[PDB]
Amino acid sequence: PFVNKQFNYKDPVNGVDIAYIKIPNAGQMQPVKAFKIHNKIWVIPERDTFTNPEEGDLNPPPEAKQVPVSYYDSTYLSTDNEKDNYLKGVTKLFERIYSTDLGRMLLTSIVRGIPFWGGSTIDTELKVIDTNCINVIQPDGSYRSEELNLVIIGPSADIIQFECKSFGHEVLNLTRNGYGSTQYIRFSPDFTFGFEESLEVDTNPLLGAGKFATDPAVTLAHQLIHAGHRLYGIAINPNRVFKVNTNAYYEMSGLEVSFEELRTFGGHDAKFIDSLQENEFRLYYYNKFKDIASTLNKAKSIVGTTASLQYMKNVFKEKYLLSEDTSGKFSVDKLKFDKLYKMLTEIYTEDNFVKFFKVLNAKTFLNFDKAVFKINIVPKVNYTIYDGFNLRNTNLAANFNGQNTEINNMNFTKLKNFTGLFEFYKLLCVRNDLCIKVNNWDLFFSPSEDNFTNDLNKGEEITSDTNIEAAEENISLDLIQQYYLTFNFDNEPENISIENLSSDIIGQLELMPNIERFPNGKKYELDKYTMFHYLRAQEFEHGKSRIALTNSVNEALLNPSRVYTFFSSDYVKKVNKATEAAMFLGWVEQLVYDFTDETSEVSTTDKIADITIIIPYIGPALNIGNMLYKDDFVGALIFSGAVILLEFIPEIAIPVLGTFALVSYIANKVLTVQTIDNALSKRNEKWDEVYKYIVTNWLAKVNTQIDLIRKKMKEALENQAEATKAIINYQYNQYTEEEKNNINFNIDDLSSKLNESINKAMININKFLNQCSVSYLMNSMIPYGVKRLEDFDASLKDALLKYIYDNRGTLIGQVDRLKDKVNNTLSTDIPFQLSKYVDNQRLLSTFTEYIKNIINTSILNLRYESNHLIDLSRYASKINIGSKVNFDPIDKNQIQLFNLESSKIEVILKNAIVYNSMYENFSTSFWIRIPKYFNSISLNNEYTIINCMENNSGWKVSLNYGEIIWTLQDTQEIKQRVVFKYSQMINISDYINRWIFVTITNNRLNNSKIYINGRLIDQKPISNLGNIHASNNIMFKLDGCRDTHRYIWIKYFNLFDKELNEKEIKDLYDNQSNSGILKDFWGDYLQYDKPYYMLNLYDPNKYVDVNNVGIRGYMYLKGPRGSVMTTNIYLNSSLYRGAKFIIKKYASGNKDNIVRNNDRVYINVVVKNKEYRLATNASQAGVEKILSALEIPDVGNLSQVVVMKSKNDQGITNKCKMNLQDNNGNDIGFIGFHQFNNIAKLVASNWYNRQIERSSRTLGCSWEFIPVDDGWGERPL
C-alpha cells in the first residue's frame, strides 16, 4: 500500500526495508534480495524457485499443462535490470490498487491480516509460527527474524501462472481455520492476458478491434483478494470445486474452478454457489473465530517477543474484529462477524474492483483467456496509476482503447502462447469421417448437478421468537461506500521485534490438490452437424491459399478454401465474382452495405411478447435451429422457446418444500400472535430461498450457455467479416498496379467499417439472447419452484388457520383479523423480483420489459404460431388437436369447433408445474364467436365448450341459448355460476354471431366475475366455495349440444394465475383487438375483394341503394330494412340487404387481403351483377359530395381513393371507416349520408372528419361491412 520510498534494485541493502531476506524455504537457501514496500509487505524480484523444490526448473515441459494459456521464458527476470523494472511495476500496481476506495480498504486488511500466533506452545501460551516470518540479513552479517504478511515473488516456470502460495503447518490449516498465514504471491507485472468482449458493445458502440488486455491491477487485485482470505484464514478448501460434467461432445473435457475462485471473482460467478453451501462456510469460519477468541481468551503468557501479551491479544483483537469486555475477555459478535466476513468475502472481489478501476475486463471467471502479452507498465506514457492504459487525453479512454491490444498495439507485444491451439481438444465427427479438432477451452461449461446443494426440504418449527429474514444487499457501490466510511484506517500493527528464529526457517508449502491431467483426443462420432462444425466452416486457411470463395453448405469445410456463411446467396455472389478495378470501390460499398445489411436483420415478432428482437441468421450461423421441423429458425424458436438454444437442458430439482411446525403457546396472546407472524414471515422468506435458488441454477446451467453462444456468434460474424476481407482482398491483391488510384482500398478501414457493422450486430444479437435467458428462466425454471411454494403456501394456510382456531379464546379479540391476515397473505404469491438476486443492468433491464407485458404472465397462452397451435407460455406439454378442428385460413388463430366429437382440442399442462391451489384465484379470457340459435332445440340446452374438471373440479365454460356461463364447483360439488345473457330479439345485436372478448376472474376470497368485452357483466360471491381441484388438462370441445349444427369460434384463449383487474382486463382487451386491422360486422379482418353489405350504424333501418348508375346518378339509403325471425327465437333486423360493397386494393397489394387501418383503397359498388366505382366530383357545390357509382373506366381523375380507417387520428376507435380523398391527396371527407330533399344520398362530407376529431358520436359515417356468414342463417335475397 502506497509504498513510501521509491526503490531501485541496486540501492544498497540496509538491514531494513531493503535487505537480504531468507524466505522460509526447505533445506538451505542462499538469501535473496527483497524490498519492503510497506509494513508487512515485501517484494522479491526473483522467480519463485525457492518456495517449491520441485519448481526450480524454469523451462517448459515437453508436455503441455492443460491450461488455455501459458508462457515460458527461462530467462525472464534474470538481469538486474529486469528486477528493477519488476520492482517498479509491482509497486505501481499497489499504488494503483491503493488509489481506489476499494483498494485502500483491502490493503489495510491485508496488512492487518497478521497470521495468528499459533505455534501452539502449551495451550495457554502464544507464539509465532516461524513459517510466518522471515530472516532478514543485516549488513553486519547478522540477522533478525521478522514477521511477514504478504510477499510478492516473481513467477515460477509458467510466467503467467499467478497464484497464492503459503507454507503449511504440521497440523494446522492456517488458511482455513482462521489463523491465516503469510502469503507468497507469484505474480508478474510484465505479462498479461488478452481477452475478448462481446457485451460492452451495448454501452460502447465502437468497442475495440479485437482482443483486449487485462489491466494488471485487477490481476494483482485478484491475487490479493486471495491473500486476504488466507491471511484471515478464511480460504475455502480447495477440495471444494464446482464439478463439471465432461462426457459429451459439447462439454468441457476438463476444468475445475474452485469455490474460492468463484468467490474471489465475485460477479455472478460467485452466485453459482448455492445458499446452503454459502452459509455452510460462514458458520464454519464463524466458528473458527470463536475458537480464535477462546484460544486467545485463555492465553496467559506469550513466548517470543518483548511485546505485551496485551499488545498481541489486541492485534488479533483488531484483526478479527473481536469484541472484548472490561475484564478483557474476547467474544465473536455474530453481527460484527457477518460484516468482516462479508467484506473479506463479497466486497473485496475482482468484479468489484473492475468498478473502481474503470477498465474493461472479463465478466466472469469462466471466460478463458486467449492470449499473453508483453506489457511495460513502468513508463507513464504507457500506464498510469490513475488511468492505466486508458490514458487521459490519449485516444485511449473512449472505449477502453488503451486496453485494446490492436488499437493500443504499441503497448502490447503479442507473445507466443505455449498451448498451441489444439493441445487439449475433442474430436467431433459428423455421421469421409468428417471430424474436427475442437478446443477444450472452447466447449461448454456444464455444471454437475451435484454442485447445487439445497436443503429446501427440511421442515421447520416456528417458535414465537424465531429470527426473521435478512436482505440480500447486492453489494452496491453504496454499500461499499458505507463500509469505507465506517472503515478504520488508522493504526497499523507495529513491527514487533521477535526473537531470532532458526537461521534457516524450515518451509514446506501448503498442499494444493493434485492436478489430475485430463484425457485428450477423445473422439465423438455424431449425427447432425454441430454448432462447432458450422463455426469451424467459417474460418478458412490463413491466406497463402487460393482466393477463397464464400459458399454455403457445410461441405464448405472440405475444400482448402473451406468457407461458409449464413448470409443471403446474393452476398455470396457479389463476393464470389471478379470485379474490374475500374469498378472496385463500388463493390466495397456494396458488400459493406450488404454486410451491415445482412448482419443487422432483426425480426420484430411483435405478436409474440416474450422474445421480441430476433436475429434469424443465428440458426444458420451456428446451426442453432438444432434441426427441427426443418429450417425457419425464427419459427423454430417460436415453437419451442429459448430452449432451442441450449446445448443442454438444465433440470431444476425443487423438492417438496417442507412445512412449518407451529409451536403453540398456552394462554399467551402475544407469544402466540407472534408465532403466526413469524410463520408468515418465514414463509415470505421461504419464497425468497426458492427464487434465489433457481436463480443460482439458472445462472450457471442456463445463462452460461447463452453467453457462450453470445461469444460464438461474435465469433461467427468475425469469421465472415474476416473472409469478406480476404476475398475482397485477393482481388485488389491482383490490382492494376496503379498508384494514386483510390485512397487505398484501406483494408484497415474497410475493417474499421466491418467492425461497426458487427458491433451493432452484436447489440441486436445480445438483446435477443438476453431475452432467451431471462425468458427461459421465467417459463422454464420459475414455474417449477413456484409450484412447490404455492403448495407450501397452500398448506401453511391451513396449518395457520388451524393454529389460530386451536388458540382462540386466547386470540379473543383477534381471532378474526389474524384469520384474515393469514388468509389474506397466503392468497397471493411473492412476486419474483430479479433485482433481488442480480445487479446485472443488462438482464434486469430485460426482466423489466418482460414483466410489463401481462401476457408473459399467463400460465397458458396459445396462439396459432408459425404452423402450430402452441402454448407460448410453455406450460402445456401436449396440445392434442382433433381432426374436425378447423382453423380459419386467414387468421388461423381463430379456431372453430363443431358439435362433432372429433373436433376438439385438449390441453394438458405439465404436471410438475401444476399446483392444485391453482384455481383459487385466477382468470381466464378468450374471444368467442357464437353462431345464432335458429332452432328451438337450442333453447334450454346448455352445452359445454371449455371444461377443466377432475371430478367436480370447478370451472368449465358452457353455452346456452343467448348466454355464456362460467361455473365454479368444488369437490364438495358445491357449484357457483356467473352468467352473461344476451337477447336474440334485437334489431342489431352486439353479440350475435360476433366476436366477443370474454374474461372471467376468480378470487377465492371473493367473487367470480364475468367480463364481456371489457365491462363487468356480473359477479357472484365465491367466498363460500370449498377447495377446488387443479385439472391437469383442459378440453376444448362442446359437450351436450343437442343441436347438430352447433359450433363456435374461439380465439386467443389465455389463462392467468391471478385475478386480472379492471384495468388489466381492458388493456388485455384492447390489445387483442387488432385495431390496426379493420373488421367484419362480425369481427373478422375486413378484406379485399369480398362483397359486403353496408349497414349504416346511424340509420340501421335503411340500406344503401344505387339510384342510378353514372355521375348523373346517386346512391342513397333506401327504405325499410327488412326484418328476420323465427318466432320464439330471434327477431333481428335483416342485414344482407341492399347493394354490396367491394374493396379494391390500391396501395400495397399482392400481400394479404386484409384491410389495414390506413390503406388507400377502392370501393366498387356492385350494381346489377356489375361492378361500378364509387366516386364523386370534388368540385361539386357544398361540403357534401353525393357520390355515384361510375363505370370503372370512366372514372378518371375523379375522387375515388378512399382511405380506410380503424383508429381515429387521435387514436380512438371510430366506426367512420371510409374517408374519400381527391387525387391531389386531399381529404374530401368521410363517407356518410345526407338528406337532399328527403332522399339522403350517400355523401362524402368533410363534416365528419371534423367531428370525428372532437367527439366519438356514432355518426352518419359509422359504417359496418357485412359479409354473409354461416352464423347468420339469413338468406341473401
Ligand SMILES: [Zn+2]
Ligand atoms: Zn484466483
